[PDB]
Design a protein around this motif. Structure first.
Motif, mmCIF file in Angstrom:
data_model
loop_
_atom_site.group_PDB
_atom_site.id
_atom_site.type_symbol
_atom_site.label_atom_id
_atom_site.label_comp_id
_atom_site.label_asym_id
_atom_site.label_seq_id
_atom_site.Cartn_x
_atom_site.Cartn_y
_atom_site.Cartn_z
ATOM 1 N N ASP A 197 33.042 47.407 30.623
ATOM 2 C CA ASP A 197 34.424 47.490 29.934
ATOM 3 C C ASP A 197 35.482 46.989 30.311
ATOM 4 O O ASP A 197 36.212 48.079 31.863
ATOM 5 C CB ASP A 197 34.087 48.220 28.121
ATOM 6 N N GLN A 198 36.562 46.524 30.258
ATOM 7 C CA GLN A 198 37.922 46.652 30.774
ATOM 8 C C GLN A 198 38.578 47.985 29.514
ATOM 9 O O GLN A 198 39.631 47.550 29.475
ATOM 10 C CB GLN A 198 38.945 45.240 29.629
ATOM 11 N N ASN A 199 37.761 48.980 29.035
ATOM 12 C CA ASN A 199 38.526 50.055 28.719
ATOM 13 C C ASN A 199 39.249 50.926 29.209
ATOM 14 O O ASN A 199 39.639 51.605 29.256
ATOM 15 C CB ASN A 199 37.467 49.953 27.727
ATOM 16 N N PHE A 227 42.018 36.458 32.970
ATOM 17 C CA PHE A 227 42.361 36.048 34.664
ATOM 18 C C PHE A 227 43.463 35.244 34.649
ATOM 19 O O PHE A 227 43.406 34.303 35.000
ATOM 20 C CB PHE A 227 41.322 36.101 35.394
ATOM 21 N N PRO A 228 44.450 35.558 34.550
ATOM 22 C CA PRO A 228 45.839 34.530 34.444
ATOM 23 C C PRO A 228 46.510 34.085 35.784
ATOM 24 O O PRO A 228 47.590 33.614 35.988
ATOM 25 C CB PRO A 228 46.589 35.291 33.369
ATOM 26 N N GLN A 229 45.623 34.553 36.635
ATOM 27 C CA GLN A 229 46.622 35.163 37.931
ATOM 28 C C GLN A 229 45.893 34.022 39.120
ATOM 29 O O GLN A 229 46.349 33.637 40.502
ATOM 30 C CB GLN A 229 47.181 36.329 38.957
ATOM 31 N N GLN A 230 44.811 33.372 39.197
ATOM 32 C CA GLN A 230 43.727 33.262 40.123
ATOM 33 C C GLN A 230 43.518 31.507 39.387
ATOM 34 O O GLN A 230 42.920 30.348 39.773
ATOM 35 C CB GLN A 230 42.201 33.229 40.245
ATOM 36 N N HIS A 231 44.908 31.027 37.655
ATOM 37 C CA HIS A 231 45.091 29.625 37.971
ATOM 38 C C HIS A 231 44.854 28.851 38.884
ATOM 39 O O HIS A 231 44.277 27.512 38.189
ATOM 40 C CB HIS A 231 45.858 29.185 37.055
ATOM 41 N N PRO A 270 40.304 35.003 47.622
ATOM 42 C CA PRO A 270 41.697 34.094 46.644
ATOM 43 C C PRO A 270 40.805 33.000 46.704
ATOM 44 O O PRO A 270 41.137 31.985 45.451
ATOM 45 C CB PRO A 270 42.633 33.998 47.780
ATOM 46 N N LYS A 271 39.909 32.440 47.404
ATOM 47 C CA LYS A 271 39.620 31.398 46.485
ATOM 48 C C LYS A 271 37.827 31.949 46.797
ATOM 49 O O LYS A 271 37.003 31.628 45.606
ATOM 50 C CB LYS A 271 39.278 30.113 48.042
ATOM 51 N N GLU A 272 36.998 32.132 46.941
ATOM 52 C CA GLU A 272 35.598 32.492 47.420
ATOM 53 C C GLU A 272 35.532 33.741 45.584
ATOM 54 O O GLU A 272 34.524 32.886 45.412
ATOM 55 C CB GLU A 272 35.060 33.629 48.287
ATOM 56 N N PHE A 273 35.582 34.665 45.410
ATOM 57 C CA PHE A 273 35.036 34.946 44.504
ATOM 58 C C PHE A 273 35.872 34.624 43.509
ATOM 59 O O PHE A 273 35.175 33.896 42.629
ATOM 60 C CB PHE A 273 35.787 37.069 44.706
ATOM 61 N N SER A 274 37.475 34.267 42.937
ATOM 62 C CA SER A 274 37.758 33.053 42.171
ATOM 63 C C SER A 274 36.954 31.776 41.671
ATOM 64 O O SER A 274 37.087 31.728 40.517
ATOM 65 C CB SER A 274 39.477 32.994 42.104
ATOM 66 N N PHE A 275 36.683 31.215 42.589
ATOM 67 C CA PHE A 275 35.801 30.201 42.662
ATOM 68 C C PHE A 275 34.833 30.087 41.870
ATOM 69 O O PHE A 275 33.990 29.328 40.920
ATOM 70 C CB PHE A 275 35.814 28.944 43.593
ATOM 71 N N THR A 276 33.499 31.187 42.256
ATOM 72 C CA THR A 276 32.561 31.237 41.705
ATOM 73 C C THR A 276 32.325 32.335 40.719
ATOM 74 O O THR A 276 31.371 32.124 39.904
ATOM 75 C CB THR A 276 31.872 32.252 42.914
ATOM 76 N N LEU A 277 33.464 33.038 40.244
ATOM 77 C CA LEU A 277 33.366 33.098 38.867
ATOM 78 C C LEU A 277 34.530 32.297 38.053
ATOM 79 O O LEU A 277 33.039 32.464 37.367
ATOM 80 C CB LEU A 277 34.657 34.685 39.063
ATOM 81 N N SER A 307 41.406 46.408 37.531
ATOM 82 C CA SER A 307 41.608 46.511 39.089
ATOM 83 C C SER A 307 40.606 46.427 39.628
ATOM 84 O O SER A 307 41.038 45.907 41.319
ATOM 85 C CB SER A 307 41.727 48.448 39.107
ATOM 86 N N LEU A 308 39.285 46.722 39.428
ATOM 87 C CA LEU A 308 37.934 46.407 40.364
ATOM 88 C C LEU A 308 37.486 44.827 40.487
ATOM 89 O O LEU A 308 37.989 44.305 41.461
ATOM 90 C CB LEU A 308 36.891 46.075 39.176
ATOM 91 N N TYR A 309 38.636 43.709 39.524
ATOM 92 C CA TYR A 309 38.758 42.280 39.169
ATOM 93 C C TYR A 309 39.679 41.948 40.017
ATOM 94 O O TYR A 309 39.780 41.329 40.997
ATOM 95 C CB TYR A 309 38.718 41.651 38.404
ATOM 96 N N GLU A 310 41.077 43.048 39.722
ATOM 97 C CA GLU A 310 42.582 42.662 40.684
ATOM 98 C C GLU A 310 41.878 42.781 42.061
ATOM 99 O O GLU A 310 42.507 41.494 43.031
ATOM 100 C CB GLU A 310 43.378 43.662 39.729
ATOM 101 N N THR A 311 41.435 43.407 42.628
ATOM 102 C CA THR A 311 41.055 43.676 44.019
ATOM 103 C C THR A 311 40.445 43.391 44.358
ATOM 104 O O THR A 311 40.463 43.304 45.609
ATOM 105 C CB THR A 311 41.062 44.905 44.194
ATOM 106 N N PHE A 312 38.917 42.390 44.174
ATOM 107 C CA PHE A 312 38.056 41.455 44.851
ATOM 108 C C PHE A 312 38.897 40.057 44.396
ATOM 109 O O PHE A 312 38.357 39.548 45.318
ATOM 110 C CB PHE A 312 37.122 41.886 44.264
#
Length: 1157
Positions: free
Chosen positions: A822-824, A864-868, A840-847, A830-835
């Motif tokens: 949870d984001q709580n 996730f507004p920053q991998q747009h 920047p392609k491999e984790f985001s695209f698959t996500l 932060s776990l998301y932002e770090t990975f």
């Protein structure tokens, strides 16, 4: 370091609480520890006899084939009083040693037992002072009474000596008795002393430097001012009688050369040569002037004779100054010491070569010729043990030679010792008087002394040098049977040190040093050759103190560890980059496997019934070596691949485990797996990180090599074992308890495979395709890794999946784990932002792929507004993957671009449209309506139009198709019948038969024969669009139709044909489109266009003529030419065309009728 290390840390914390196992292996495990300890006890015994060639209270610190270094059974710790000057002198000619300090003089037996050994003390006078803050000088004298020396078969005295002569201030006091000295008042003691005033002070600046006994002839003493006093100290046969013999110092007396020379310069060496007898001794005088004098002392001789009186100071400069200036600067003669041949002296001097910044210490062996005061310099040898200047005059380096005088030819080489405050250099010389042997390049080895414990005195006899040290007492530096010259060979300097490090640092509490960084650079290869010879000596137990086992194969291994540790520390430190990367890594790789191997043996045997079966498979292994007797040397020392005999069996044990459980046998096997792996992996792991700054980390491999515990075979047995364990443990729902066990198996598996990918890619491309083997490694990993991660998530090692995901790649898993959290928690966002930052392609695209499947559409856009920017890449996919519900979502989000591309894949699937008639018609409607909802988000407005167009397109297709089916295609104009039909009929029939749909047949059929209802569109198209095709193309096609039109009006007399096509283009404004001509005489221009694309290849398939049809056309163009020479064709065109041009108002250029453009 990073990745791996952190993962480990997480592993222990989670897994360790909650886990119960059973198994009994205890009995054999504790028993192996005792018999392993006992092998080492047996082995330790065998070293003690061989190492030590004198152990009691003596303790040999090293031993080679040229020296033995050991302390004697005394030390000079205890019962002494530490004072500023400890001056020692060791007397070997009486055997018993002397050490004096400020307050007392101690004379002791130095070959006696205990370190609290009996010291015979004589307190100095309190009436004479010289205990002021400098030690008085004391030396012993030779016994010569009671059979010319005390019997030593009868134990007469402790110290069988003469008197003790003590210089206190300016007074020399000869006590003949050392035990009649009253230890209270010393005025009693004086009555049996003779006392004599020396004209120097032994507490001034004129002090006694050396006392030298040249008995029975008297004593020669030097001062530090160049004043030399020869005193015979007795009559003979004891009895004090100090009488000043003669001053040997003079200002080079007498006229014309006492005003040119002075002998008031200090003498740096006085040394004894042989006692010939009856108060004659040879005595050698060496000064800093570099004059050598050999003096014969007389008491049976007629007169003193000086045999040799030759200079050498400027003879070093006739070979080290006749080329290069490497003997430039200072040249100070420090000491000389006689060789075995006494007419020859070895000189110790140094030079400072300031050009190289090196200091060469120079042993110059000079052979003197007495019959003409000549020299021959036989050999010169550079020390390269020091390259920096010692200029100390509190500590002058001295050469010591335990020379023979007995037999000279016992050994062909004489050991030279170079004493330093921080080393004993042991080198070697040669003497055979022959012009066929090298005089340089000798063997030198160096035994280093620590700087706190130093030389206060020394003595030698004829084979051993006795060195008196500060607290360690008298060390006998024994010269044994050294190898003479190069004829008689030996070991090496590099070689030697490796043996020092490994074997002889076992013996502790010494001033003897055993690990030595290079003092002198030598190339890698020589150094690597010696490290390998030692490394096999440990490794197959062919050592010089390693026995090959006196117990079992298993017991053996423990002793080797202890030897392996010493070597490893030395190699790593000192020779770091004096070896190759492969070579350094090899040496560690054998240690690592070894540690794993000790534990391995300890644990394997376990229960008694499993122990017996361990032996049985082991007997089989030995017999496939060639022959058997049970136990080969292959299983004795480690092959570095020890689980390969028990291992298949263990794998099979696991295999029988899952179908049929045996209750306690689930826990029993699990515990065993757990235990070994823990032991093995921990060792291995930690040894590599020493080797972090000796190349490699635990996430890298080298280019030629990967570790020897990473190989396909191991991995296959381990991977197969996991799945059978997890089904059984799941079914019982005892799974939780084994959570530690499950993690360990997977972590090692991942890791080994990942390092293997890195190795595989460091092999050439050709080699990757040459090995199926590498591919089979890759298959073994890839099918099974997804499933591994899933099992960890059940046992709540989800956090661990995260680590797994980072380090090993498993980005799908990473999405799954993270959506559970949870984001709580602030840490979760932060776990998301770090990975994202790491990938920047491999984790985001698959996500993004994951989300569309898991109906998590709100998370895709907004969380996730920053991998747009990557998300625009995702849209460009042909379809995202989530089926036919995917495209719908995409219309809904204002993300239309992804969907247009999706819908293409929809319309070819016969299962998404074409389920049934009703559903099919519905689907078509829905696609159309969805198109209508394109906004301005994504400009798919053009596609919108195409979707609408598409039902009209299918009708156009079908329309024309039906016509062709009913013989819609017409007969070709060429001749009575069209050849095309002979093809057209064939295509109709096959498709008229009730059989399978033939796609090719419908395509060919559709175009080949042309509706006359569709001739208007080609004419329209070339007007509007045709200047883009090239004028010359457009003109050609337009001319073709025109030909036929003007080929009918000329035939008869009724024109009206001419205007209809002309006036026709005016209705749709074809001229206005420009460059469009009307029907007119084709002439030459039509012909030129016709020839180049002459083949038409349409008739190419046909057997007869092929191009001729072009010639026939040529005939048609010419018929128009023949009619325009009539000019009755022209009359028809003008009148017709121009009538239409009065309702349509066009301008007609008559005579070849064109519309002005």
């Amino acid at each position: 370091m990073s990745e791996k290390k952190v993962h480990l840390r997480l592993r222990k914390e989670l897994s360790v609480p909650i886990a119960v196992v059973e198994n009994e292996s205890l009995a054999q495990l504790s028993y192996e520890e005792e018999s392993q300890a006992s092998l080492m006890d047996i082995s330790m015994e065998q070293q003690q006899l061989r190492l030590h060639s004198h152990f009691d209270n003596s303790k040999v610190f090293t031993e080679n084939n040229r020296y033995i270094v050991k302390t004697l059974q005394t030390d000079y710790s205890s019962g002494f009083s530490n004072d500023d000057e400890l001056n020692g002198y060791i007397d070997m000619q009486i055997g018993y040693g002397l050490v004096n300090d400020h307050k007392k003089v101690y004379i002791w037996n130095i070959h006696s037992t205990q370190k609290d050994t009996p010291y015979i003390t004589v307190p100095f006078r309190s009436d004479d002072n010289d205990e002021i803050a400098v030690a008085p000088r004391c030396i012993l004298t030779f016994p010569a009474t009671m059979d010319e020396s005390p019997l030593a078969l009868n134990p007469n005295d402790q110290d069988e000596t003469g008197g003790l002569i003590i210089i206190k201030g300016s007074k020399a006091i000869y006590y003949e008795d050392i035990n009649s000295i009253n230890n209270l008042n010393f005025k009693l003691s004086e009555k049996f002393s003779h006392e004599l005033e020396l004209p120097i002070n032994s507490s001034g600046g004129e002090k006694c430097d050396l006392m030298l006994n040249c008995e029975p002839a008297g004593i020669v003493l030097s001062t530090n001012m160049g004043r030399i006093f020869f005193i015979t100290i007795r009559n003979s046969m004891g009895k004090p009688q100090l009488k000043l013999g003669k001053l040997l110092n003079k200002p080079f007396k007498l006229g014309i050369w006492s005003k040119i020379f002075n002998t008031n310069s200090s003498v740096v060496s006085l040394r004894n040569g042989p006692i010939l007898g009856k108060g004659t001794r040879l005595v050698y005088i060496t000064t800093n002037k570099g004059i050598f004098q050999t003096w014969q002392l007389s008491a049976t001789n007629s007169h003193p004779t000086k045999l040799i009186d030759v200079n050498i100071y400027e003879a070093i400069l006739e070979s080290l100054q006749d080329l290069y200036p490497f003997a430039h600067g200072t040249l100070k003669i420090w000491d000389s010491h006689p060789l075995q041949d006494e007419s020859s002296q070895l000189f110790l001097s140094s030079i400072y070569d300031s050009s190289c910044n090196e200091t060469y210490y120079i042993l110059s062996t000079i052979i003197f010729d007495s019959s003409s005061n000549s020299f021959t310099i036989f050999s010169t040898y550079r020390l390269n043990t020091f390259m920096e200047s010692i200029t100390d005059t509190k500590f002058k380096p001295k050469i010591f030679i335990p020379q023979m005088e007995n037999a000279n030819d016992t050994n062909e080489v004489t050991s030279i010792l170079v004493m330093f405050p921080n080393a004993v250099v042991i080198t070697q010389v040669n003497s055979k008087l022959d012009s066929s042997y090298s005089m340089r390049r000798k063997w030198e080895d160096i035994v280093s002394l620590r700087n706190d414990i130093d030389i206060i005195g020394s003595g030698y006899d004829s084979k051993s040098l006795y060195v008196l040290t500060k607290q360690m007492g008298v060390l006998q530096f024994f010269v044994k049977e050294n190898e003479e010259t190069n004829s008689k060979p030996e070991v090496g300097f590099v070689k030697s040190h490796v043996d020092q490090a490994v074997y002889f640092s076992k013996i502790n509490a010494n001033p003897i040093d055993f690990n030595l960084p290079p003092e002198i650079s030598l190339d890698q290869e020589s150094i690597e050759h010696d490290l390998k010879l030692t490394s096999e000596e440990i490794f197959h137990s062919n050592g010089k103190y390693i026995p090959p086992m006196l117990n079992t194969l298993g017991q053996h291994l423990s002793v080797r560890k202890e030897f392996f540790q010493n070597f490893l520390t030395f190699v790593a430190k000192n020779f770091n980059y004096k070896i190759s990367p492969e070579l350094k890594l090899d040496l560690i790789e054998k240690f690592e496997i070894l540690n794993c191997c000790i534990k391995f043996n300890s644990i394997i045997r376990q229960s008694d019934v499993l122990n017996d079966i361990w032996e049985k498979t082991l007997s089989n292994y030995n017999l496939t070596q060639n022959e058997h007797l049970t136990t080969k040397t292959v299983v004795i020392n480690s092959p570095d691949v020890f689980p390969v005999i028990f291992k298949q069996f263990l794998n099979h044990v696991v295999f029988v485990l899952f179908p049929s459980q045996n209750q306690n046998f689930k826990l029993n096997v699990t515990n065993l797996i757990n235990l070994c792996f823990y032991d093995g992996i921990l060792e291995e792991g930690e040894k590599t990180i020493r080797y972090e700054l000796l190349e490699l980390d635990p996430m890298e491999v080298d280019t030629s090599k990967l570790p020897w515990f990473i190989n396909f075979d191991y991995l296959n047995c381990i991977n197969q074992c996991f799945f059978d364990f997890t089904f059984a443990c799941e079914e019982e729902g005892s799974l939780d308890s084994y959570k530690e066990g499950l993690l360990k198996i997977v972590k090692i598996l991942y890791y080994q495979f990942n390092q293997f990918k890195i190795w595989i890619n460091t092999q050439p491309v050709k080699s990757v395709n040459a090995n199926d083997n590498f591919i089979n490694i890759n298959n073994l990993y890839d099918d099974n890794h997804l499933d591994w991660n899933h099992v960890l998530c059940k046992v709540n090692l989800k956090e661990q999946c995260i680590q797994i995901a980072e380090f090993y790649k498993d980005l799908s898993g990473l999405v799954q784990t993270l959506q559970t959290l949870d984001q709580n928690d602030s840490t979760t966002v932060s776990l998301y932002e770090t990975f994202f930052n790491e990938f920047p392609k491999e984790f985001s695209f698959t996500l993004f792929e994951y989300l569309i499947k898991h109906k998590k559409l709100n998370d895709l856009i907004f969380r996730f507004p920053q991998q747009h920017d990557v998300l625009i890449q995702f849209f460009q996919e042909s379809a995202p993957k989530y089926g036919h519900v995917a495209w719908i979502q995409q219309i809904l989000d204002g993300s239309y671009a992804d969907a247009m591309n999706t819908l293409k894949n929809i319309t070819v699937d016969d299962s998404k449209k074409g389920e049934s008639l009703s559903e099919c018609e519905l689907h078509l409607n829905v696609a159309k309506l969805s198109s209508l909802l394109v906004e301005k988000d994504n400009l798919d407005i053009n596609t919108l139009r195409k979707i609408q167009y598409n039902l009209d397109t299918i009708d156009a297709e079908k329309n024309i198709s039906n016509k062709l089916k009913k013989g819609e295609v017409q007969i070709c104009k060429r001749f009575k019948n069209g050849s095309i039909r002979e093809v057209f009929n064939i295509l109709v029939e096959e498709l008229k038969s009730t059989t399978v749909v033939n796609l090719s047949d419908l395509v060919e059929l559709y175009s080949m024969l042309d509706d006359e209802e569709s001739l208007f569109i080609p004419l329209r198209l070339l007007s509007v669009d045709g200047n883009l095709l090239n004028f010359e193309v457009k003109k050609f096609l337009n001319a073709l139709v025109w030909r036929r039109i003007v080929l009918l009006n000329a035939s008869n007399e009724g024109d009206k044909l001419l205007q209809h096509i002309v006036k026709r283009v005016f209705d749709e404004e074809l001229p206005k489109n420009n460059d469009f001509p009307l029907p007119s005489v084709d002439l030459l221009c039509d012909k030129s266009l016709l020839t180049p694309e002459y083949i038409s290849e349409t008739y190419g398939r046909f057997p007869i003529d092929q191009n001729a049809i072009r010639e026939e056309i040529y005939e048609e163009i010419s018929q128009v030419e023949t009619l325009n020479s009539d000019n009755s064709l022209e009359i028809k065109l003008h009148s017709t065309i121009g009538s239409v041009a009065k309702e349509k108002n066009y301008t007609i250029n008559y005579e070849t009728n064109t519309v002005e453009y």
